[PDB]
Amino acid sequence: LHWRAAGAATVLLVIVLLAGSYLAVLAERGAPGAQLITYPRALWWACETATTVXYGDLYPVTLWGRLVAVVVMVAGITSFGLVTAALATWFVGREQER
Amino acid sequence: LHWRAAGAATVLLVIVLLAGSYLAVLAERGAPGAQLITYPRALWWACETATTVXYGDLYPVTLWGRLVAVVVMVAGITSFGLVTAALATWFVGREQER
Amino acid sequence: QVQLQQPGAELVKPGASVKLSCKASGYTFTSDWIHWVKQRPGHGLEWIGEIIPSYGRANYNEKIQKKATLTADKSSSTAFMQLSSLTSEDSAVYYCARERGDGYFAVWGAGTTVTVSSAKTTPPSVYPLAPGSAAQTNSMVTLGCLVKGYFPEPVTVTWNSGSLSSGVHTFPAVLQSDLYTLSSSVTVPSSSWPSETVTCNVAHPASSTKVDKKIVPRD
Amino acid sequence: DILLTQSPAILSVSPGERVSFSCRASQSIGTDIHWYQQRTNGSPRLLIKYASESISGIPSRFSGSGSGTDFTLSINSVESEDIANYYCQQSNRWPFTFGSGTKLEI
Amino acid sequence: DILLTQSPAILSVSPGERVSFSCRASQSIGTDIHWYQQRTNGSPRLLIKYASESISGIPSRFSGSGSGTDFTLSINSVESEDIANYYCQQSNRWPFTFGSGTKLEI
Ligand SMILES: CCCCCCCCCCCCCC(=O)O[C@@H](CO)COC(=O)CCCCCCCC
Ligand SMILES: CCCCCCCCCCCCCC(=O)O[C@@H](CO)COC(=O)CCCCCCCC
Ligand SMILES: [K+]
Ligand SMILES: [K+]
Ligand SMILES: [K+]
């Protein structure tokens, strides 16, 4: 169960980074002063957002850009909680055994 | 037990983001140069604070604003530790079983 | 309906204090803030301070001398501004405005004209202005009303209880000997007067008076 | 505190012409500028919020643009009812502040 | 290092009038400015901290305002005892620095 939930989350995270990159540019163009407006740097912004690093070099200023950002965040965080929970499950079993 | 603790934490987190947004504006208006002073962007700031992303586009400069920020942080972090611990519990059981 | 209601005027002796009011209606939210803005005659808008009724906290402009104290009554949906120890520098129109916590002032009150002076209140005498007997008329005729000897400002003049607006000019008041005077002008088709009545209505908030003067041809 | 400079203080245009009012902020404020019209003896009225957003009830004639430190309020084809003083106001940092105002003359 | 410019260096006012001293920082320092009064042959005395905060023992007559790069120390109704040199000082970045001082003349 756990590994499949984790693997799926990883696949789902990759999809969210790419879709999030596309949707962030769509949301932010048309807002004066917005910088999250070209796709290559938007993919970079989605990665530093999903990992929760959040340098501050780029960020959304619109309502829809910010909603996209929160989905990226939660997708990243969730994937990591799942990988962590999966590692714990693995270890717990190998330790029962040892 | 675990799912209810997690579900409750999620509900409690939503309440903290909204109350935190309101209280941050209350704390920060009256401090010259403060930017966390209107509610829509304060809700956005509470979300990027609770997820620990912390872009740096907005932040509190007053003592009470900062105390509010730490409560938002701990509420976010705690909710995620609870969801993670809940996923681990779920997986551990389904794996005993498998 | 008017979202923010303020009294038209307050006369204050130098050194005395006065409490201005701003009654709010329409939608009210916990995120609302009521702001006060000062505007001296011929000058710009100066922010005085704000209060959030839901919590009762108030902040003030640090750049100016603090003359104001803000409070709010939740049950009467009224915001108050206590101005104290005033001087002539405090004479101005004070507006209240409502901000939904999103940074702009969606609506403004009509403002309260505060005059700081030792002079006494005096309602205006309203006299009719009708053409003389030798005055020839064109397709239009001009009438008016003379509003003199009042204090303090302002007066509001309307024609036919407000139904007659186009063709109206109310001149700025002139101050001579602790008393103001102004006149208002109205122009209507010559064929309609005196068949259709023309009356000027003069309101003087400071004395709580409102008088009417029908304009009839000179005997 | 943020200083908003409105210059020129008086703008004279011919009827039906396009006119633009300028508001410059002392530091970058994003798009947190709002514009008000105040006719003689009238109270201020909001025209445009957050630099370019329309307000219901306001003629389509009015529009706003800019971000950062330089903002513009434009009127396409001015008419008599546009005669009034116009003020900008920022909400980016506390305290809110107002520009000194521009008068439109026709 | 942060340069604090106090200009004019000498301010002359009439008794009871409101006076304002200016301190401009070479870069933005938030509200990390403090003001001192130094009377002839006296040591400096703190009047206002963090741009606008009161200090107990100081007459209510004194107040401060501003944030960023421009700061003001104001005295409502000046009196003889206010005759002195006034200095601003920043604590935003190391090292702390002082403005060059303004003398109040009545
Ligand atoms: C009194 C209780 C207050 C509680 C908070 C309520 C905040 C107001 C509602 C939120 C947005 C309204 C949009 C608007 O008119 O603002 C937009 C204008 O362009 C930009 O929005 C923004 O840029 C802010 C985005 C905030 C995103 C939050 C996502 C949370 C999952
Ligand atoms: C020698 C041992 C030192 C240990 C650290 C002690 C620090 C001093 C006490 C803290 C605040 C005093 C307030 C003050 O006078 O400052 C306020 C002035 O506006 C603003 O506060 C601030 O803006 C700082 C906020 C810090 C919040 C920390 C929250 C931690 C859960
Ligand atoms: K981070
Ligand atoms: K960060
Ligand atoms: K950052």
XYZ file of C-alpha atoms and ligand atoms in Angstrom:
692
model
C 0.000 0.000 0.000
C 2.438 2.656 1.211
C 4.916 2.490 -1.697
C 2.169 2.766 -4.264
C 0.681 5.735 -2.482
C 4.147 7.265 -2.451
C 4.959 6.424 -6.044
C 1.622 7.784 -7.170
C 2.180 10.978 -5.143
C 5.536 11.457 -6.874
C 3.911 11.066 -10.291
C 1.127 13.341 -9.264
C 3.653 15.924 -7.972
C 5.443 16.005 -11.340
C 2.112 16.629 -13.027
C 1.257 19.412 -10.573
C 4.664 21.146 -11.131
C 4.145 21.169 -14.897
C 0.442 22.158 -14.777
C 1.154 24.598 -11.954
C 3.895 26.219 -14.100
C 1.453 26.636 -17.017
C -1.420 27.887 -14.876
C 0.735 30.320 -12.902
C 1.833 32.091 -16.139
C -1.829 32.125 -17.319
C -2.911 33.655 -14.049
C -0.161 36.215 -13.695
C 0.125 37.716 -17.183
C -2.168 40.757 -17.303
C -1.200 41.820 -13.732
C 1.153 44.855 -13.940
C 4.443 44.192 -12.268
C 3.984 40.361 -12.168
C 7.234 38.405 -12.707
C 5.950 34.753 -12.791
C 5.206 35.155 -16.454
C 7.465 32.921 -18.578
C 7.390 29.077 -18.399
C 10.973 28.107 -17.703
C 11.262 30.252 -14.602
C 7.709 29.352 -13.591
C 8.744 25.654 -13.518
C 11.706 26.663 -11.339
C 9.332 28.669 -9.046
C 7.012 25.621 -8.784
C 9.927 23.414 -7.712
C 11.198 25.845 -4.988
C 7.583 26.262 -3.815
C 6.780 22.526 -3.634
C 9.921 21.825 -1.595
C 8.881 24.777 0.691
C 12.336 26.370 0.180
C 10.760 29.626 -1.149
C 13.680 31.922 -1.958
C 11.477 34.877 -2.844
C 13.056 35.457 -6.299
C 9.603 34.840 -7.844
C 6.064 34.642 -6.508
C 2.442 35.222 -7.583
C 0.682 38.519 -7.029
C -2.775 37.546 -8.316
C -5.616 35.639 -6.594
C -5.520 32.735 -9.101
C -1.729 32.637 -9.125
C -1.778 32.366 -5.333
C -4.434 29.580 -5.413
C -2.212 27.714 -7.888
C 0.744 28.276 -5.540
C -1.178 26.767 -2.540
C -2.053 23.652 -4.610
C 1.666 23.276 -5.535
C 2.621 23.675 -1.910
C 0.130 21.142 -0.570
C 1.060 18.672 -3.399
C 4.718 18.931 -2.479
C 4.166 18.673 1.236
C 1.728 15.768 0.894
C 4.192 13.810 -1.310
C 6.811 14.159 1.271
C 4.553 13.165 4.170
C 3.700 10.090 2.086
C 7.307 9.183 1.354
C 8.151 9.665 5.007
C 5.222 7.568 6.171
C 6.286 4.925 3.585
C 9.863 4.845 4.914
C 8.534 4.514 8.455
C 6.344 1.589 7.404
C 9.257 -0.110 5.666
C 11.578 0.346 8.651
C 8.981 -0.705 11.190
C 8.610 -4.043 9.360
C 12.263 -4.746 8.849
C 12.823 -3.962 12.506
C 9.938 -6.305 13.759
C 11.934 -8.841 11.788
C 15.509 -8.022 12.894
C -7.734 8.092 16.717
C -5.160 9.330 14.205
C -7.568 10.394 11.432
C -9.707 12.370 13.827
C -6.674 14.109 15.237
C -5.650 14.890 11.675
C -9.081 15.986 10.531
C -9.450 18.183 13.579
C -5.991 19.696 12.972
C -7.021 20.552 9.410
C -10.179 22.267 10.656
C -8.219 24.008 13.323
C -5.612 25.128 10.741
C -8.306 26.740 8.573
C -9.545 28.619 11.616
C -6.020 29.758 12.494
C -5.382 31.031 8.903
C -8.555 33.125 8.978
C -8.098 34.401 12.565
C -4.372 34.840 11.967
C -5.160 36.955 8.861
C -7.500 39.194 10.901
C -5.166 39.498 13.878
C -2.086 40.182 11.755
C -3.789 43.231 10.133
C -4.938 44.394 13.616
C -1.418 44.084 14.927
C 0.400 45.653 12.017
C -1.698 48.722 11.194
C -0.262 51.645 13.173
C 3.357 50.500 12.533
C 4.942 52.820 9.907
C 6.146 50.921 6.906
C 4.131 47.730 7.718
C 2.777 45.932 4.618
C 0.664 43.104 6.208
C -2.228 45.491 6.483
C -5.110 44.441 4.206
C -7.048 41.144 4.648
C -6.815 39.468 1.272
C -3.037 39.571 1.151
C -2.849 38.773 4.864
C -4.743 35.501 4.183
C -2.223 34.775 1.415
C 0.672 35.561 3.847
C -0.873 33.197 6.447
C -1.028 30.379 3.888
C 2.637 30.784 2.726
C 3.671 31.010 6.400
C 1.759 27.904 7.553
C 3.242 25.799 4.746
C 6.709 27.194 5.772
C 7.312 28.317 2.152
C 7.886 31.963 3.262
C 8.594 33.906 0.073
C 9.345 37.152 1.882
C 6.838 39.255 -0.132
C 5.039 40.040 3.161
C 5.880 39.654 6.834
C 5.117 41.213 10.239
C 7.283 43.917 11.746
C 5.507 44.267 15.105
C 5.779 42.152 18.287
C 2.107 41.046 18.164
C 2.218 40.451 14.420
C 5.250 38.215 14.933
C 3.543 36.298 17.802
C 0.564 35.747 15.486
C 2.982 34.558 12.783
C 4.588 31.968 15.169
C 1.120 30.589 16.076
C 0.321 30.250 12.324
C 3.624 28.524 11.764
C 3.255 26.040 14.612
C -0.412 25.353 13.587
C 0.678 24.573 10.052
C 3.628 22.457 11.052
C 1.648 20.550 13.686
C -1.142 19.745 11.171
C 1.339 18.301 8.847
C 3.122 16.243 11.507
C -0.335 14.899 12.387
C -1.265 14.031 8.817
C 2.103 12.374 8.361
C 1.800 10.410 11.583
C -1.750 9.429 10.469
C -0.505 8.160 7.092
C 2.222 6.184 8.847
C -0.352 4.603 11.156
C -2.590 3.704 8.227
C 0.275 2.176 6.236
C 1.709 0.307 9.194
C -1.654 -1.457 9.650
C -2.285 -2.278 6.042
C 1.235 -3.646 5.840
C 0.875 -5.869 9.050
C -2.056 -7.217 7.078
C -0.510 -7.617 3.595
C -29.508 54.667 0.908
C -26.724 57.060 2.241
C -24.090 54.725 3.725
C -22.435 57.209 6.114
C -24.398 60.054 7.765
C -22.632 63.007 9.260
C -24.083 66.276 10.742
C -23.500 69.273 8.455
C -21.703 71.576 10.860
C -20.312 72.255 14.287
C -19.286 75.678 15.674
C -16.546 75.464 18.339
C -14.989 78.188 20.502
C -11.176 78.248 20.593
C -10.030 75.853 23.272
C -13.253 73.868 23.466
C -13.715 70.334 22.201
C -16.378 68.700 19.987
C -17.419 65.137 19.220
C -18.212 64.399 15.573
C -20.403 61.497 14.568
C -20.672 59.165 11.576
C -23.654 56.799 11.456
C -23.185 53.822 9.172
C -25.748 51.760 7.297
C -25.605 49.170 4.496
C -23.503 45.983 4.820
C -21.234 45.813 7.866
C -18.375 43.338 8.286
C -15.839 42.536 10.970
C -13.152 43.611 8.586
C -14.552 47.174 8.270
C -12.493 50.147 9.209
C -13.848 53.732 9.493
C -11.369 56.466 8.615
C -11.460 60.229 9.176
C -10.051 62.706 6.713
C -9.469 66.434 7.154
C -9.786 68.959 4.370
C -9.159 72.705 4.837
C -10.836 75.084 2.388
C -8.984 75.181 -0.892
C -6.597 72.410 0.229
C -6.115 68.648 -0.135
C -7.167 65.534 1.783
C -5.258 64.775 5.015
C -5.635 61.411 6.747
C -6.349 61.752 10.504
C -6.776 58.161 11.629
C -8.846 54.981 11.573
C -10.759 52.694 13.890
C -11.927 49.075 13.461
C -15.349 48.850 15.176
C -15.304 45.097 15.562
C -12.312 45.333 17.916
C -12.305 49.051 18.949
C -8.643 49.731 18.112
C -7.638 53.085 16.574
C -4.453 54.329 14.837
C -3.502 57.914 14.063
C -1.430 59.920 11.616
C 1.959 60.361 13.378
C 2.977 63.319 11.211
C 0.445 65.720 12.639
C -0.422 67.053 16.089
C -2.953 64.682 17.649
C -6.288 66.477 18.064
C -8.459 63.400 17.621
C -9.659 60.459 19.685
C -11.673 57.755 17.893
C -14.326 55.512 19.322
C -17.152 53.437 17.928
C -20.507 52.165 19.180
C -21.381 48.724 17.822
C -25.112 48.707 18.640
C -25.769 52.149 17.116
C -23.361 51.480 14.232
C -21.862 54.880 14.925
C -18.218 55.973 14.772
C -17.105 59.068 16.739
C -14.235 61.532 16.495
C -13.502 63.649 19.559
C -11.585 66.775 18.591
C -10.191 68.725 21.559
C -8.617 72.073 22.460
C -9.205 73.392 18.963
C -7.817 76.473 17.269
C -8.558 78.092 13.881
C -6.051 75.676 12.355
C -8.654 72.975 13.106
C -11.385 74.710 11.068
C -12.094 72.398 8.064
C -14.499 69.804 6.657
C -13.954 66.384 8.356
C -15.086 63.388 6.401
C -15.634 59.888 7.605
C -15.083 57.079 5.061
C -15.495 53.281 5.098
C -12.805 50.838 4.001
C -13.590 47.122 3.787
C -10.073 46.188 4.970
C -8.858 46.147 1.368
C -7.213 49.573 1.220
C -9.590 51.899 -0.643
C -12.384 54.105 0.572
C -15.495 52.691 -1.064
C -17.763 55.357 0.383
C -17.501 58.728 2.062
C -19.767 60.742 4.336
C -20.854 64.249 3.247
C -18.522 65.762 5.745
C -18.968 67.991 8.787
C -17.851 71.582 8.443
C -16.208 72.532 11.751
C -15.646 76.232 12.369
C -13.487 77.295 15.343
C -14.513 80.856 16.291
C -15.728 82.960 19.225
C -18.479 84.419 17.057
C -22.096 83.401 17.589
C -24.418 81.310 15.414
C -26.762 83.334 13.203
C -29.379 82.018 10.749
C -29.441 83.689 7.311
C -32.028 86.231 6.083
C -33.264 85.035 2.675
C -34.424 87.697 0.201
C -35.918 87.236 -3.278
C -34.197 88.419 -6.476
C -36.775 89.165 -9.183
C -36.181 91.395 -12.243
C -37.041 95.062 -12.178
C -39.955 96.383 -14.164
C -37.815 97.680 -17.050
C -35.862 94.446 -17.487
C -36.568 92.886 -20.900
C -36.607 89.084 -20.987
C -35.339 86.728 -23.716
C -36.373 83.094 -24.065
C -34.921 82.600 -20.563
C -35.340 84.498 -17.314
C -32.902 84.642 -14.397
C -34.005 84.767 -10.777
C -32.206 84.280 -7.515
C -32.122 84.500 -3.801
C -29.869 86.519 -1.521
C -28.714 84.682 1.616
C -27.116 87.099 4.053
C -25.911 87.555 7.561
C -25.224 83.995 8.607
C -22.576 82.234 10.618
C -20.895 79.837 10.507
C -20.680 78.143 7.103
C -22.212 76.372 5.309
C -25.709 76.843 3.922
C -27.174 74.568 1.277
C -29.460 76.155 -1.328
C -31.817 74.199 -3.509
C -34.532 75.256 -5.957
C -38.031 73.791 -5.877
C -36.995 71.346 -3.187
C -34.267 69.964 -5.376
C -36.393 69.225 -8.453
C -34.879 72.183 -10.303
C -31.084 71.638 -10.710
C -29.991 72.581 -14.178
C -29.433 76.319 -14.645
C -28.438 76.849 -10.999
C -25.283 78.746 -9.738
C -24.731 79.185 -6.001
C -21.835 81.570 -5.388
C -19.111 81.107 -2.773
C -19.869 83.062 0.410
C -18.030 86.296 1.308
C -17.090 87.021 4.885
C -17.563 90.509 6.220
C -17.867 91.327 9.897
C -18.254 87.835 11.403
C -21.085 87.192 8.944
C -21.379 85.424 5.587
C -23.413 86.306 2.534
C -24.007 84.632 -0.815
C -26.607 84.477 -3.540
C -27.830 81.655 -5.735
C -28.952 82.003 -9.291
C -31.496 79.989 -11.311
C -32.463 80.330 -14.967
C -35.750 78.963 -16.404
C -37.621 79.485 -19.701
C -39.280 82.919 -19.505
C -42.598 81.356 -20.488
C -42.649 79.125 -17.384
C -42.434 81.838 -14.706
C -44.465 82.914 -12.853
C -46.934 80.315 -14.168
C -44.831 77.503 -12.722
C -43.592 78.431 -9.258
C -39.865 78.920 -8.385
C -38.865 78.811 -4.707
C -35.377 78.652 -3.213
C -34.860 76.461 -0.092
C -32.065 77.480 2.248
C -30.746 75.115 4.885
C -28.360 76.324 7.612
C -27.244 73.231 9.594
C -25.496 75.210 12.342
C -28.742 76.839 13.437
C -30.953 73.890 12.515
C -32.994 76.127 10.237
C -34.385 75.608 6.734
C -36.427 78.381 5.119
C -38.211 78.831 1.798
C -38.595 81.965 -0.289
C -40.962 81.923 -3.219
C -39.846 84.214 -6.052
C -42.722 86.284 -7.405
C -42.688 89.119 -9.884
C -42.300 92.593 -8.437
C -45.735 94.208 -7.867
C 5.684 57.255 4.920
C 4.902 57.135 1.223
C 4.867 60.413 -0.583
C 2.531 60.650 -3.610
C 3.363 63.439 -6.038
C 0.688 64.599 -8.430
C 2.100 67.017 -11.005
C 1.027 69.088 -12.742
C -1.436 70.422 -10.195
C -3.678 71.816 -12.991
C -4.431 70.167 -16.309
C -6.245 72.104 -19.126
C -7.630 70.158 -22.053
C -10.040 70.777 -24.930
C -13.492 69.107 -24.956
C -13.462 65.486 -26.136
C -9.699 65.165 -25.861
C -7.929 62.306 -23.914
C -6.322 63.453 -20.736
C -4.006 61.730 -18.275
C -3.262 62.550 -14.612
C 0.033 61.474 -13.092
C 0.734 60.080 -9.584
C 4.317 59.167 -8.625
C 5.093 57.272 -5.403
C 8.332 57.846 -3.400
C 8.948 54.108 -3.417
C 7.527 51.090 -5.239
C 3.971 50.217 -4.124
C 2.904 47.516 -6.582
C -0.555 48.386 -7.845
C -1.890 49.606 -4.535
C -3.062 52.960 -5.787
C -6.747 54.153 -5.874
C -8.135 57.313 -7.514
C -10.912 59.695 -6.350
C -12.799 62.485 -8.029
C -13.954 65.421 -5.915
C -16.262 67.987 -7.556
C -16.668 71.472 -6.120
C -18.441 71.250 -2.738
C -18.788 67.483 -3.169
C -17.317 64.565 -1.280
C -14.649 62.349 -2.842
C -15.792 59.507 -5.038
C -13.816 56.395 -5.845
C -13.153 55.986 -9.603
C -10.525 53.273 -9.994
C -9.106 50.829 -7.426
C -5.798 48.927 -7.444
C -4.423 51.053 -10.326
C -6.672 49.797 -13.114
C -9.800 48.151 -11.698
C -13.221 49.469 -12.646
C -15.816 50.523 -10.176
C -19.490 49.916 -11.040
C -21.386 53.119 -11.713
C -18.311 54.900 -13.096
C -18.363 55.856 -16.775
C -16.289 53.553 -19.021
C -14.518 56.736 -20.007
C -12.210 56.454 -16.986
C -9.310 53.983 -16.802
C -6.073 53.586 -14.866
C -2.632 52.134 -15.509
C 0.841 51.679 -14.098
C 2.607 49.754 -11.320
C 5.681 50.387 -9.157
C 6.145 54.120 -8.690
C 4.333 55.677 -11.682
C 0.587 55.692 -12.129
C -1.807 57.298 -14.537
C -5.524 58.031 -14.474
C -6.874 58.593 -17.986
C -10.134 60.049 -19.256
C -11.020 59.290 -22.890
C -12.932 62.233 -24.366
C -13.311 64.621 -21.427
C -16.584 66.422 -20.887
C -17.834 69.118 -18.534
C -18.924 66.783 -15.742
C -15.266 65.715 -15.466
C -14.328 69.145 -14.112
C -13.165 68.384 -10.538
C -10.030 67.735 -8.419
C -8.566 64.204 -8.652
C -6.575 62.520 -5.927
C -4.544 59.314 -5.774
C -4.199 57.326 -2.502
C -1.907 54.379 -1.629
C -2.624 51.376 0.587
C 0.679 49.487 0.228
C 2.247 50.540 3.526
C 0.910 52.059 6.728
C -0.170 54.753 7.027
C -2.292 55.238 3.933
C -1.476 58.524 2.234
C -2.946 60.841 -0.412
C -1.441 62.729 -3.361
C -1.863 66.563 -3.371
C -4.442 66.552 -6.149
C -4.767 67.620 -9.793
C -7.541 70.002 -10.987
C -8.981 69.368 -14.495
C -9.865 72.569 -16.427
C -11.646 72.498 -19.798
C 27.707 52.522 6.489
C 24.502 54.496 6.845
C 24.762 58.200 6.375
C 22.238 60.331 8.313
C 21.753 63.838 6.956
C 20.245 66.449 9.221
C 19.465 69.643 7.307
C 19.077 72.446 7.980
C 21.817 72.547 10.591
C 20.118 75.509 12.358
C 16.404 76.001 12.868
C 15.002 79.369 14.161
C 11.425 79.492 15.367
C 9.229 81.873 17.362
C 8.133 80.970 20.925
C 5.182 78.568 21.086
C 5.422 77.632 17.425
C 5.592 73.962 16.157
C 8.958 73.007 14.833
C 10.202 69.939 12.983
C 13.756 68.572 12.597
C 14.608 66.408 9.611
C 16.829 63.281 9.450
C 17.313 61.512 6.099
C 19.027 58.108 5.876
C 21.177 57.073 2.853
C 19.165 53.874 2.580
C 15.932 52.518 4.047
C 16.221 51.689 7.772
C 12.643 50.887 8.787
C 11.887 52.765 11.983
C 15.259 52.210 13.577
C 15.971 55.840 14.288
C 16.364 57.394 17.815
C 16.634 61.098 18.713
C 18.766 62.854 21.379
C 18.778 66.339 22.799
C 22.087 67.829 23.921
C 21.989 71.165 25.782
C 25.063 73.369 26.035
C 27.693 71.631 28.201
C 25.274 68.761 28.834
C 25.347 65.114 27.862
C 22.965 63.724 25.242
C 19.528 62.676 26.375
C 17.260 60.231 24.608
C 13.918 61.796 23.554
C 12.247 59.373 21.155
C 13.145 55.769 20.270
C 12.261 53.731 17.167
C 11.062 56.849 15.281
C 7.933 57.594 17.297
C 8.076 55.899 20.703
C 7.829 57.979 23.858
C 10.346 57.905 26.616
C 9.113 58.367 30.205
C 10.192 61.664 31.713
C 10.147 63.461 28.350
C 7.577 66.224 27.889
C 4.545 65.207 25.786
C 5.530 68.145 23.631
C 8.024 65.982 21.724
C 6.980 63.418 19.100
C 8.546 61.609 16.158
C 7.388 60.260 12.812
C 8.493 58.648 9.581
C 9.867 55.318 8.330
C 12.174 54.271 5.482
C 14.612 57.076 4.740
C 12.858 60.219 6.045
C 12.308 60.989 9.697
C 11.043 63.943 11.641
C 11.311 65.037 15.259
C 8.604 67.561 16.137
C 8.170 69.905 19.082
C 4.666 71.327 19.606
C 4.930 74.835 21.060
C 8.671 75.320 21.560
C 9.941 76.991 24.697
C 13.315 78.165 25.963
C 14.339 74.881 27.575
C 14.170 73.335 24.086
C 17.211 75.351 23.005
C 19.853 72.653 22.337
C 21.432 70.549 19.540
C 19.394 67.520 18.384
C 20.864 64.389 16.883
C 19.353 61.346 15.181
C 21.038 57.899 15.399
C 20.284 54.654 13.500
C 20.480 51.067 14.737
C 19.316 49.221 11.599
C 22.730 48.129 10.334
C 26.175 47.881 11.890
C 27.833 50.123 12.750
C 25.397 52.467 14.447
C 25.793 56.003 13.145
C 24.757 59.550 14.084
C 23.380 62.486 12.083
C 25.429 65.753 12.152
C 22.967 67.579 14.383
C 20.474 70.454 14.186
C 20.627 73.463 16.575
C 17.271 74.999 17.651
C 17.342 78.823 18.012
C 14.389 80.804 19.390
C -12.618 39.525 8.141
C -12.106 38.127 7.839
C -11.090 38.159 6.716
C -10.660 36.754 6.305
C -9.818 36.771 5.032
C -10.651 37.109 3.795
C -9.767 37.568 2.643
C -10.590 38.050 1.450
C -11.022 36.907 0.511
C -9.875 36.419 -0.402
C -9.650 36.909 -1.721
C -10.533 37.967 -2.394
C -9.966 38.384 -3.739
C -9.824 39.906 -3.868
O -10.831 40.638 -3.903
O -8.512 40.492 -3.936
C -7.852 40.310 -5.232
C -7.715 41.657 -5.964
O -6.898 41.550 -7.168
C -6.482 39.695 -5.042
O -6.511 38.685 -4.082
C -5.193 38.301 -3.647
O -4.179 38.534 -4.341
C -5.072 37.531 -2.371
C -4.998 36.052 -2.640
C -5.290 35.262 -1.385
C -5.322 33.782 -1.686
C -5.673 32.987 -0.453
C -5.743 31.508 -0.764
C -6.157 30.725 0.464
C -6.296 29.249 0.155
C 19.906 38.534 26.568
C 18.921 37.455 26.153
C 18.045 37.938 25.015
C 16.960 36.923 24.669
C 15.942 37.498 23.687
C 15.047 38.554 24.338
C 14.372 39.427 23.289
C 13.592 40.578 23.921
C 12.164 40.183 24.342
C 11.190 40.102 23.146
C 10.360 41.181 22.726
C 10.325 42.545 23.427
C 9.451 43.530 22.673
C 10.175 44.851 22.379
O 10.493 45.620 23.305
O 10.499 45.194 21.020
C 9.345 45.641 20.233
C 9.468 47.136 19.892
O 8.440 47.573 18.954
C 9.238 44.835 18.956
O 9.495 43.485 19.188
C 9.716 42.750 17.969
O 9.309 43.173 16.865
C 10.375 41.411 18.067
C 9.351 40.308 18.096
C 9.962 39.022 18.601
C 8.904 37.950 18.732
C 9.491 36.678 19.295
C 8.425 35.618 19.461
C 9.011 34.368 20.084
C 7.944 33.319 20.319
K 11.102 28.167 3.607
K 11.805 31.080 2.523
K 12.554 34.181 1.368
